[PDB]
Design a binder for this molecule. Structure first.
Ligand SMILES: CN1CC[C@@H](c2ccc(F)cc2)[C@H](CO)C1
Length: 282
């Protein structure tokens, strides 16, 4: 079926939970043996969210190459994304090592450091120009260059320096600051505006390594971001945009990381975002 009318048909019939449970039943199951090794317990935020072995990002290190991060490679859309958990106190250096080694331009953050009164990820970037951060375990230096605070999101320019080689690179930090503590946003308008700002920066384009996207577990809000981006790109590329099947795209993405889209409300919000976004593109 088309999307907008499949949408109204699920609303009128109130069957979002049944649709979402079908997706969960059909989703791929691949091994994640490296994630579960005892030496990696303090590298995982949640025991039930792990990268598959076949698609995990490897750190360029001979001691321990493990990080909770997955490469989502979308062949028809010609887009790639790295989806990862929010960094932990003992993985902030690994996080920036990955950004460096994978040649990423942009980092997309969809959570606040504190939500619901608890810490959802480490304070992994500097908050003042004159107070830079040094990660001694991976030999990197990170400096805040500029910060632009808007009503729904903040954009930061950061300098990452590899202290071994003295090479430097400019990294863009795109921080969506207004996702509610509970539920999903009422309108997709500010989320779509944010996605378009990331696109306009070059961070999603083939001349750079894959964008790094995270929330707390790296599967819920993060899944909504890449699912909406890929579906809108396919609607631009194909002769028949109504052929784009968001459930099929989501199942394809779940071949590369488990659990993408965590609730039926997130599924409905993803439909809403693609539907509204397709009208603005034209
Ligand atoms: C966590 N999950 C359990 C089932 C496993 C599996 C094994 C054999 C198969 F034919 C199909 C699935 C999967 C890969 O090992 C990991």
């Amino acid at each position: 079926m088309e999307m907008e009318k499949e949408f109204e048909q699920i609303d009128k019939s109130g069957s979002w939970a049944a649709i979402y449970q079908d997706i969960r039943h059909e989703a791929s199951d691949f091994p994640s043996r490296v994630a579960k090794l005892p030496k990696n317990k303090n590298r995982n935020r949640y025991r039930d969210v792990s990268p598959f072995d076949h698609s995990r990002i490897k750190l360029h290190q001979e001691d321990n190459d493990y990080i909770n991060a997955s490469l989502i490679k979308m062949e028809e859309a010609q887009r790639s994304y790295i989806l990862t958990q929010g960094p932990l106190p003992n993985t902030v250096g690994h996080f920036w090592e990955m950004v460096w080694e994978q040649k990423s331009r942009g980092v997309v953050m969809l959570n606040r450091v504190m939500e619901k009164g608890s810490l959802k990820c480490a304070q992994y970037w500097p908050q003042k120009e004159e107070k830079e951060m040094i990660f001694e375990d991976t030999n990197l230096k990170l400096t805040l260059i500029s910060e632009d605070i808007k009503s729904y999101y903040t954009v930061r320019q950061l300098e990452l320096e590899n202290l071994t080689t003295q090479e430097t690179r400019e990294i863009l930090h795109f921080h969506y600051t207004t996702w509610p503590d509970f539920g999903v946003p009422e309108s997709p308008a500010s989320f779509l505006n944010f996605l378009f700002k990331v696109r306009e920066s070059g961070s999603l384009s083939p001349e750079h390594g894959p964008v790094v996207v995270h929330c707390s577990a790296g599967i819920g809000r993060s899944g909504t971001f890449c699912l909406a981006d890929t579906c809108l790109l396919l609607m631009d590329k194909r002769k028949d945009p109504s052929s784009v099947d968001i459930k099929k795209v989501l199942l394809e993405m779940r071949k590369f990381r488990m659990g993408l889209i965590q609730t039926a409300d997130q599924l409905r919000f993803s439909y809403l975002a693609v539907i509204e976004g397709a009208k603005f593109i034209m």
